[PDB]
Enzyme design. Sequence first.
Site, PDB file in Angstrom:
ATOM      1  N   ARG A 106       1.542  14.994  28.757  1.00  9.94           N
ATOM      2  CA  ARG A 106       2.594  14.774  27.759  1.00  9.94           C
ATOM      3  C   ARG A 106       3.053  16.063  27.087  1.00  9.94           C
ATOM      4  O   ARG A 106       3.880  16.033  26.172  1.00  9.94           O
ATOM      5  CB  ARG A 106       2.148  13.763  26.697  1.00  9.94           C
ATOM      6  CG  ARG A 106       1.669  12.450  27.284  1.00  9.94           C
ATOM      7  CD  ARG A 106       1.674  11.341  26.246  1.00  9.94           C
ATOM      8  NE  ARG A 106       0.912  11.692  25.058  1.00  9.94           N
ATOM      9  CZ  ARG A 106      -0.389  11.468  24.904  1.00  9.94           C
ATOM     10  NH1 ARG A 106      -1.089  10.898  25.879  1.00  9.94           N
ATOM     11  NH2 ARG A 106      -0.990  11.822  23.771  1.00  9.94           N
TER      12      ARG A 106
ATOM     13  N   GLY B  20      -7.470  16.559  23.002  1.00 10.10           N
ATOM     14  CA  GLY B  20      -8.788  16.146  22.561  1.00 10.10           C
ATOM     15  C   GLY B  20      -9.804  16.360  23.669  1.00 10.10           C
ATOM     16  O   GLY B  20     -10.949  16.715  23.404  1.00 10.10           O
TER      17      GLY B  20
ATOM     18  N   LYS C 100       0.827  -1.203   0.000  1.00  8.00           N
ATOM     19  CA  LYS C 100       0.000   0.000   0.000  1.00  8.00           C
ATOM     20  C   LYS C 100       0.856   1.246   0.000  1.00  8.00           C
ATOM     21  O   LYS C 100       0.539   2.235  -0.666  1.00  8.00           O
ATOM     22  CB  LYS C 100      -0.928   0.006   1.210  1.00  8.00           C
ATOM     23  CG  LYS C 100      -1.972  -1.094   1.167  1.00  8.00           C
ATOM     24  CD  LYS C 100      -2.928  -1.007   2.349  1.00  8.00           C
ATOM     25  CE  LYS C 100      -4.160  -1.839   2.096  1.00  8.00           C
ATOM     26  NZ  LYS C 100      -3.782  -3.214   1.678  1.00  8.00           N
TER      27      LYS C 100
ATOM     28  N   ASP D  49     -13.022  13.260  31.608  1.00  6.99           N
ATOM     29  CA  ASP D  49     -13.035  11.971  32.287  1.00  6.99           C
ATOM     30  C   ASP D  49     -12.372  12.159  33.645  1.00  6.99           C
ATOM     31  O   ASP D  49     -11.368  12.859  33.750  1.00  6.99           O
ATOM     32  CB  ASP D  49     -12.255  10.932  31.483  1.00  6.99           C
ATOM     33  CG  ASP D  49     -12.831  10.701  30.089  1.00  6.99           C
ATOM     34  OD1 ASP D  49     -14.058  10.486  29.967  1.00  6.99           O
ATOM     35  OD2 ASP D  49     -12.052  10.753  29.114  1.00  6.99           O
TER      36      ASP D  49
HETATM   37  N1  LIG Z   1      -4.149   0.704  28.166  1.00  7.01           N
HETATM   38  C1  LIG Z   1      -4.890   1.601  27.449  1.00  7.01           C
HETATM   39  N2  LIG Z   1      -4.897   2.851  27.881  1.00  7.01           N
HETATM   40  C2  LIG Z   1      -5.641   3.686  27.152  1.00  7.01           C
HETATM   41  C3  LIG Z   1      -6.377   3.368  26.019  1.00  7.01           C
HETATM   42  N3  LIG Z   1      -7.020   4.465  25.533  1.00  7.01           N
HETATM   43  C4  LIG Z   1      -6.671   5.435  26.335  1.00  7.01           C
HETATM   44  N4  LIG Z   1      -5.856   5.025  27.345  1.00  7.01           N
HETATM   45  C5  LIG Z   1      -5.279   5.870  28.373  1.00  7.01           C
HETATM   46  C6  LIG Z   1      -4.005   6.533  27.815  1.00  7.01           C
HETATM   47  C7  LIG Z   1      -4.563   7.901  27.335  1.00  7.01           C
HETATM   48  O1  LIG Z   1      -3.531   8.884  27.239  1.00  7.01           O
HETATM   49  C8  LIG Z   1      -5.536   8.194  28.496  1.00  7.01           C
HETATM   50  C9  LIG Z   1      -6.584   9.236  28.118  1.00  7.01           C
HETATM   51  O2  LIG Z   1      -7.255   8.788  26.933  1.00  7.01           O
HETATM   52  P1  LIG Z   1      -7.611   9.854  25.774  1.00  7.01           P
HETATM   53  O3  LIG Z   1      -8.614   9.182  24.713  1.00  7.01           O
HETATM   54  O4  LIG Z   1      -8.222  11.051  26.398  1.00  7.01           O
HETATM   55  O5  LIG Z   1      -6.257  10.236  25.019  1.00  7.01           O
HETATM   56  P2  LIG Z   1      -5.136  11.376  25.081  1.00  7.01           P
HETATM   57  O6  LIG Z   1      -5.297  12.381  26.315  1.00  7.01           O
HETATM   58  O7  LIG Z   1      -3.788  10.710  25.074  1.00  7.01           O
HETATM   59  O8  LIG Z   1      -5.391  12.149  23.707  1.00  7.01           O
HETATM   60  P3  LIG Z   1      -6.318  13.387  23.287  1.00  7.01           P
HETATM   61  O9  LIG Z   1      -5.394  14.675  23.156  1.00  7.01           O
HETATM   62  O10 LIG Z   1      -7.326  13.565  24.335  1.00  7.01           O
HETATM   63  O11 LIG Z   1      -7.057  13.042  21.908  1.00  7.01           O
HETATM   64  O12 LIG Z   1      -6.195   6.924  28.666  1.00  7.01           O
HETATM   65  C10 LIG Z   1      -6.342   2.031  25.596  1.00  7.01           C
HETATM   66  O13 LIG Z   1      -6.952   1.647  24.609  1.00  7.01           O
HETATM   67  N5  LIG Z   1      -5.578   1.176  26.340  1.00  7.01           N
HETATM   68 CA   LIG Z   2     -10.342  11.281  27.761  1.00  5.51          CA
HETATM   69 CA   LIG Z   3      -7.391  13.359  26.683  1.00  6.70          CA
END
Ligand SMILES: Nc1nc2c(ncn2[C@H]2C[C@H](O)[C@@H](COP(=O)(O)OP(=O)(O)OP(=O)(O)O)O2)c(=O)[nH]1
Ligand SMILES: [Ca+2]
Ligand SMILES: [Ca+2]
Length: 326
Positions: free
Chosen positions: A174, A180, A63, A247
């Site tokens: 981070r 998001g 791809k 959350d």
């Molecule tokens: N082990 C595991 N942890 C997860 C998964 N999804 C999310 N997490 C944990 C790590 C993420 O940084 C944290 C918060 O989830 P988020 O969907 O809000 O993502 P994040 O803050 O990294 O990105 P964002 O800028 O909000 O789109 O939850 C998953 O599928 N597996």
């Molecule tokens: Ca979240």
């Molecule tokens: Ca987030």
Amino acid sequence: TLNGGITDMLTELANFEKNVSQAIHKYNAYRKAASVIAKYPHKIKSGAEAKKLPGVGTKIAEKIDEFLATGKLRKLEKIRQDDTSSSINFLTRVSGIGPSAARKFVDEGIKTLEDLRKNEDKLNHHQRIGLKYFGDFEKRIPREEMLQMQDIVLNEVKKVDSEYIATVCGSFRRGAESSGDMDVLLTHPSFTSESTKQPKLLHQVVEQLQKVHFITDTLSKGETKFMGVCQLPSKNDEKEYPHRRIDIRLIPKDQYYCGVLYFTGSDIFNKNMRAHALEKGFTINEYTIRPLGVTGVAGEPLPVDSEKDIFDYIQWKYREPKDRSE
DNA sequence: GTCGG
DNA sequence: GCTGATGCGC
DNA sequence: CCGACCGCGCATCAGC
Ligand SMILES: Nc1nc2c(ncn2[C@H]2C[C@H](O)[C@@H](COP(=O)(O)OP(=O)(O)OP(=O)(O)O)O2)c(=O)[nH]1
Ligand SMILES: [Ca+2]
Ligand SMILES: [Ca+2]
């Protein structure tokens, strides 16, 4: 983003596999390949160069070669034309509507924003709120607003009980210039892995944030996890801020380091780290890291005094939050 | 879809 | 009601 | 080749 074209392509493919094919391992395969390519520090010149990376195999190399030659993927051009795939992909963008629900809706003839908006009574609570704030939820949050949000949450939690510690994790921790959504890790000395010496610990905090009109809707709520909606206060004569997803996770105080590792992510980083843990004979969750026994049975929780200790167990050099953005 | 045993 | 599977989301 | 793919909270539904 040296390789934006490629990683966008793979991301679209992953989404197709999750939302339409309902093939969760193909989704993860595409995501894993997308992530490995995204951190690759060279502009990729062939599928063979890409196939050198772990998680990129034959099919993805093929791809990547097509994409490089033409700038398109025929498989994707076709997916974009298929109305059923397009409708399902759209509906899943609503929080609470996943691949199964989206396909059910498309069968019932509900497949546009207008359709959803005249059939709210066919939606569960979560879905209804996801529809209500459909537009707001797709906007990202400037770190500057994330900081105001942090100040409100931290200060309101202090007013309920000065013993609470609230830490904002996710992409904010981070160091992202935009997030998001907001993720808050909460601890209180009354709640450990040994005892819950106090009921309603999460409830009380949610209540206080509702009281000051910060939290505006609930998507779901249990004793340890709140998922909802919040909004910054706006000034006189100014347009309101978008509604944001928030959350909140209450974690036993003695398991903070495992919890903050989990909530800091990224998701792919966590999946990669946990996978590696299994290869080193450990299993990691948001609470503990435990040895695996011969039988394949998780043993007892190993002692952890820092995020770094978790990295130590699995023989990884420590990676600061800002370098876990996979 | 990719990979390690 | 409870239990376990499934959907959805982190 | 082929088993295995991270791990878990809350909402919902079937079966008892
Ligand atoms: N082990 C595991 N942890 C997860 C998964 N999804 C999310 N997490 C944990 C790590 C993420 O940084 C944290 C918060 O989830 P988020 O969907 O809000 O993502 P994040 O803050 O990294 O990105 P964002 O800028 O909000 O789109 O939850 C998953 O599928 N597996
Ligand atoms: Ca979240
Ligand atoms: Ca987030």
